[PDB]
Design an enzyme around this catalytic site. Structure first.
Site, PDB file in Angstrom:
ATOM      1  N   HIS A   1       0.807  -1.226   0.000  1.00 19.76           N
ATOM      2  CA  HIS A   1       0.000   0.000   0.000  1.00 19.76           C
ATOM      3  C   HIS A   1       0.844   1.281   0.000  1.00 19.76           C
ATOM      4  O   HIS A   1       0.343   2.367  -0.300  1.00 19.76           O
ATOM      5  CB  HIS A   1      -0.937  -0.005   1.207  1.00 19.76           C
ATOM      6  CG  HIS A   1      -1.677  -1.294   1.390  1.00 19.76           C
ATOM      7  ND1 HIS A   1      -2.831  -1.600   0.699  1.00 19.76           N
ATOM      8  CD2 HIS A   1      -1.429  -2.358   2.192  1.00 19.76           C
ATOM      9  CE1 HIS A   1      -3.261  -2.794   1.065  1.00 19.76           C
ATOM     10  NE2 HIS A   1      -2.429  -3.273   1.973  1.00 19.76           N
TER      11      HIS A   1
ATOM     12  N   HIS B   1       6.818   6.544   5.740  1.00 16.30           N
ATOM     13  CA  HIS B   1       6.298   6.107   4.453  1.00 16.30           C
ATOM     14  C   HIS B   1       5.695   7.305   3.752  1.00 16.30           C
ATOM     15  O   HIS B   1       5.623   8.398   4.335  1.00 16.30           O
ATOM     16  CB  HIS B   1       5.236   5.024   4.627  1.00 16.30           C
ATOM     17  CG  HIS B   1       4.064   5.487   5.426  1.00 16.30           C
ATOM     18  ND1 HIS B   1       4.034   5.423   6.802  1.00 16.30           N
ATOM     19  CD2 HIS B   1       2.906   6.079   5.048  1.00 16.30           C
ATOM     20  CE1 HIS B   1       2.894   5.933   7.236  1.00 16.30           C
ATOM     21  NE2 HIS B   1       2.188   6.327   6.192  1.00 16.30           N
TER      22      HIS B   1
ATOM     23  N   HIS C   1       2.509   8.827   0.850  1.00 14.01           N
ATOM     24  CA  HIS C   1       1.318   8.724   0.027  1.00 14.01           C
ATOM     25  C   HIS C   1       1.501   9.671  -1.144  1.00 14.01           C
ATOM     26  O   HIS C   1       1.967  10.790  -0.937  1.00 14.01           O
ATOM     27  CB  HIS C   1       0.073   9.100   0.820  1.00 14.01           C
ATOM     28  CG  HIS C   1      -0.088   8.323   2.088  1.00 14.01           C
ATOM     29  ND1 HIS C   1      -0.883   7.201   2.169  1.00 14.01           N
ATOM     30  CD2 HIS C   1       0.454   8.494   3.317  1.00 14.01           C
ATOM     31  CE1 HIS C   1      -0.846   6.728   3.404  1.00 14.01           C
ATOM     32  NE2 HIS C   1      -0.035   7.489   4.118  1.00 14.01           N
TER      33      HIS C   1
ATOM     34  N   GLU D   1      -2.762  13.424   1.665  1.00  6.97           N
ATOM     35  CA  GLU D   1      -3.940  12.991   2.387  1.00  6.97           C
ATOM     36  C   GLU D   1      -4.575  14.199   3.071  1.00  6.97           C
ATOM     37  O   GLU D   1      -5.742  14.498   2.838  1.00  6.97           O
ATOM     38  CB  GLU D   1      -3.561  11.901   3.387  1.00  6.97           C
ATOM     39  CG  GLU D   1      -2.913  10.698   2.709  1.00  6.97           C
ATOM     40  CD  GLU D   1      -3.133   9.423   3.492  1.00  6.97           C
ATOM     41  OE1 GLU D   1      -2.632   9.335   4.630  1.00  6.97           O
ATOM     42  OE2 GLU D   1      -3.807   8.521   2.957  1.00  6.97           O
TER      43      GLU D   1
ATOM     44  N   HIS E   1       4.808  10.639   6.054  1.00  7.67           N
ATOM     45  CA  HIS E   1       4.381  10.365   7.421  1.00  7.67           C
ATOM     46  C   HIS E   1       5.514   9.729   8.202  1.00  7.67           C
ATOM     47  O   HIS E   1       5.979   8.649   7.841  1.00  7.67           O
ATOM     48  CB  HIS E   1       3.158   9.442   7.432  1.00  7.67           C
ATOM     49  CG  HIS E   1       1.919  10.093   6.898  1.00  7.67           C
ATOM     50  ND1 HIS E   1       0.839   9.381   6.419  1.00  7.67           N
ATOM     51  CD2 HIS E   1       1.593  11.402   6.782  1.00  7.67           C
ATOM     52  CE1 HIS E   1      -0.100  10.226   6.028  1.00  7.67           C
ATOM     53  NE2 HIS E   1       0.331  11.457   6.235  1.00  7.67           N
TER      54      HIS E   1
ATOM     55  N   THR F   1      -4.640   6.554   8.723  1.00  4.59           N
ATOM     56  CA  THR F   1      -5.344   6.788   7.460  1.00  4.59           C
ATOM     57  C   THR F   1      -5.439   5.535   6.590  1.00  4.59           C
ATOM     58  O   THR F   1      -5.959   5.593   5.476  1.00  4.59           O
ATOM     59  CB  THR F   1      -4.677   7.883   6.621  1.00  4.59           C
ATOM     60  OG1 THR F   1      -3.396   7.418   6.186  1.00  4.59           O
ATOM     61  CG2 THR F   1      -4.526   9.175   7.425  1.00  4.59           C
TER      62      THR F   1
HETATM   63  N1  3J3 Z   1      -1.036   6.427   7.318  1.00  5.41           N
HETATM   64  S1  3J3 Z   1      -0.859   6.516   8.775  1.00  5.41           S
HETATM   65  O1  3J3 Z   1      -1.650   7.339   9.268  1.00  5.41           O
HETATM   66  O2  3J3 Z   1       0.429   6.954   8.996  1.00  5.41           O
HETATM   67  O3  3J3 Z   1      -1.053   5.197   9.288  1.00  5.41           O
HETATM   68  C1  3J3 Z   1      -0.345   4.115  10.046  1.00  5.41           C
HETATM   69  C2  3J3 Z   1       0.920   4.300  10.565  1.00  5.41           C
HETATM   70  C3  3J3 Z   1       1.521   3.052  11.210  1.00  5.41           C
HETATM   71  N2  3J3 Z   1       0.828   1.816  11.160  1.00  5.41           N
HETATM   72  S2  3J3 Z   1       0.536   1.041  12.347  1.00  5.41           S
HETATM   73  O4  3J3 Z   1      -0.819   0.627  12.416  1.00  5.41           O
HETATM   74  O5  3J3 Z   1       0.852   1.871  13.511  1.00  5.41           O
HETATM   75  C4  3J3 Z   1       1.517  -0.219  12.991  1.00  5.41           C
HETATM   76  O6  3J3 Z   1       0.637  -1.313  13.266  1.00  5.41           O
HETATM   77  C5  3J3 Z   1       1.256  -2.670  13.323  1.00  5.41           C
HETATM   78  C6  3J3 Z   1       0.927  -3.228  14.550  1.00  5.41           C
HETATM   79  O7  3J3 Z   1      -0.465  -3.204  14.328  1.00  5.41           O
HETATM   80  C7  3J3 Z   1       2.667  -2.814  12.714  1.00  5.41           C
HETATM   81  O8  3J3 Z   1       3.545  -3.645  13.393  1.00  5.41           O
HETATM   82  C8  3J3 Z   1       3.272  -1.635  12.034  1.00  5.41           C
HETATM   83  O9  3J3 Z   1       4.684  -1.739  12.249  1.00  5.41           O
HETATM   84  C9  3J3 Z   1       2.839  -0.309  12.374  1.00  5.41           C
HETATM   85  O10 3J3 Z   1       3.031   0.750  11.397  1.00  5.41           O
HETATM   86  C10 3J3 Z   1      -0.036   1.661  10.047  1.00  5.41           C
HETATM   87  C11 3J3 Z   1      -0.653   2.879   9.410  1.00  5.41           C
HETATM   88 ZN    ZN Z   2       0.501   7.408   6.098  1.00  4.28          ZN
END
Ligand code: 3J3
Ligand code: ZN
Length: 258
Positions: free
Chosen positions: A62, A92, A94, A104, A117, A196
């Protein structure tokens, strides 16, 4: 099926497997700059990345992410709206299929070409799995990308992307300094929000920097060469992996600056 960004499994579908998609503190949001209120009580952001230890870079189907050693208080985010210490886990991006979309969060409805992010978790909860179950478990530092001059600090990232083209591929990615991805100013907006991507957990203090970084067209075009698909599957470019702005509802966006 399993979630994604396409017509049949995109953001508009996510609520079926993750009903919190329609919750009270979902992200991203539009940042209305004239409505955000300056909060003089906000402490300055403390970004301490000098001892950051990057481990690997990974296509997770993703986005792509650079992962850090979070087994001790090396790279941490403190201050700002936060209480306590948040460890950097990964960053990461987007991004869009074209420069006019990809971010986003939006600023007065303006979409940026991409959004970075930097994901941190609250050390009082011990591990990120426990942190994502808490309303203050995560702090994500969001940085906008616009297209213009190149960002030298990003080039080491873009240069290994062809080695992680497809879902599941990873590579060693040591000694990367995420400080080279930050803009000059740490002026920010902040609001309570969510992940997100699924599971869209409402566990995030968002810290979104006002100042974008500039990246070159060549740098973003390498983002767009990645694939959502695993190897051997029909090639679907990893583009437009962004969730659109969600209802602000009963929330106030605060600004760290006048
Ligand atoms: N896009 S965003 O807002 O930055 O979203 C998040 C940021 C980080 N993750 S996460 O859910 O915290 C996280 O969850 C897991 C445990 O559930 C993993 O081990 C991941 O390493 C981790 O990113 C996934 C998506
Ligand atoms: Zn993100």
């Amino acid at each position: 099926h399993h979630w994604g960004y396409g017509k049949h499994n995109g953001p508009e579908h996510w609520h079926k497997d993750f009903p919190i998609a329609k919750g009270e503190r979902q992200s991203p949001v539009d940042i209305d700059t004239h409505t955000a209120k300056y909060d003089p009580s906000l402490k300055p952001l403390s970004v301490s990345y000098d001892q950051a230890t990057s481990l690997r870079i990974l296509n997770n189907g993703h986005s792509f992410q650079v992962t850090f050693d979070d087994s001790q208080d090396k790279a941490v985010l403190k201050g700002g709206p936060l209480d306590g210490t948040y460890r950097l886990l990964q960053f990461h991006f987007h991004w869009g299929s074209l420069d006019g979309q990809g971010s986003e969060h939006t600023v007065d409805k303006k979409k940026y070409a991409a959004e970075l992010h930097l994901v941190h978790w609250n050390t009082k909860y011990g591990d990120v799995g426990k942190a994502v179950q808490q309303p203050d478990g995560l702090a994500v530092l969001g940085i906008f990308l616009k297209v213009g001059s190149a960002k030298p600090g990003l080039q080491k990232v873009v240069d290994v992307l062809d080695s992680i083209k497809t879902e599941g591929k990873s590579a060693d990615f040591t000694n990367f300094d995420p400080r080279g991805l930050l803009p000059e100013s740490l002026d920010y907006w902040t609001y309570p929000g969510s992940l997100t991507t699924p599971p869209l957990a409402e566990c995030v203090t968002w810290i979104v920097l006002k100042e974008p970084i500039s990246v070159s067209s060549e740098q973003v075009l390498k983002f767009r060469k990645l694939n959502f698909n695993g190897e051997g599957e029909p090639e679907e470019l990893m583009v437009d992996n962004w969730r659109p702005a969600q209802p602000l509802k009963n929330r106030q966006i605060k600004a760290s600056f006048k």
